Amino acid sequence: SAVQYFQFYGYLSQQQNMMQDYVRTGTYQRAILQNHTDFKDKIVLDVGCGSGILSFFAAQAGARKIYAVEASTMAQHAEVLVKSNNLTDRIVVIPGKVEEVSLPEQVDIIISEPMGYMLFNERMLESYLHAKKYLKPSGNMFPTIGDVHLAPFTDEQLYMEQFTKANFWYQPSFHGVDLSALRGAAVDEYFRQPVVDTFDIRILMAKSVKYTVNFLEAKEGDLHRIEIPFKFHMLHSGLVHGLAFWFDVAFIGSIMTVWLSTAPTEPLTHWYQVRCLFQSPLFAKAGDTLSGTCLLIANKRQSYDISIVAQVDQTGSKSSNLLDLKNPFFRYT
């Protein structure tokens, strides 16, 4: 599984999809350049540098030395750009996993873009936290903190999309074959996929709950088990069809704090937003409380198993759901 993961990042087309996200790339450049005193004459570590763009931004801000670590074959293309941009004296590409390379010295700041879709996919936040073994005391992290937001939504047409697709299997005579015994399994398969896509904010039924990872303070092992309790106070009545997810990160520099948001109230990014459907939706009236837990359990496919259990307190009616974050429905395609 890890072989495929790093192969995926060997493609310039993948680098390009990220680089062409202007909200992402421009916000990284702004956060680094407008906090130029965090970089001027400093030593920096770029974790998972890909084509090296963030290391070039650190160099634009005046960093003295940049160690750019890349485990995919993109490392070879980054070295070509460093040479062609006349920066071999200041950016050193170090091919390998950040858990396995040797840096020659400690650094003043770590920069990275370790956010997967739904923030946590790819388990690269752990690689980012692991890299703090190279961080000097009172070194900084860019990004510094990450906020996940979760909110209940109603979207009857998205929900019905599922049974539309699964009812293919409810055919007693597909070319003379009765498929119908697999209908439950087909339904389960579709509902186990998080839906990656943007949406209209009018589906949202309550103010979001916020869960914060402080990258300066967190330890790698803190991300193996992510328990997110929630109690939503429903602002609207309706059928709750699942939970919507987005994230923000903040670059807390000495001059200013810069925010990168993937919220559905903000311009679209290449991360879109994520929705986890409930195979059994819950009825809530405005004023009701929808409470439960979203538990994310790290797995051996660079991702998480998602367990979401929710109940409406006034009614006792409950819904429990398992999703496989590694294998979502990229509905925006």
Ligand SMILES: CNCCNCc1cccc(-c2nc(NC3CCOCC3)c(C)c(-c3c(C)noc3C)n2)c1
């Ligand atoms: C660490 N900073 C990365 C910033 N980018 C995050 C992001 C934002 C939006 C989408 C993806 C995405 N796209 C994938 N394929 C495309 C889907 C649509 O059709 C064309 C191909 C895959 C396979 C993955 C993936 C990875 C990586 N590991 O597992 C999985 C699954 N992720 C990733």
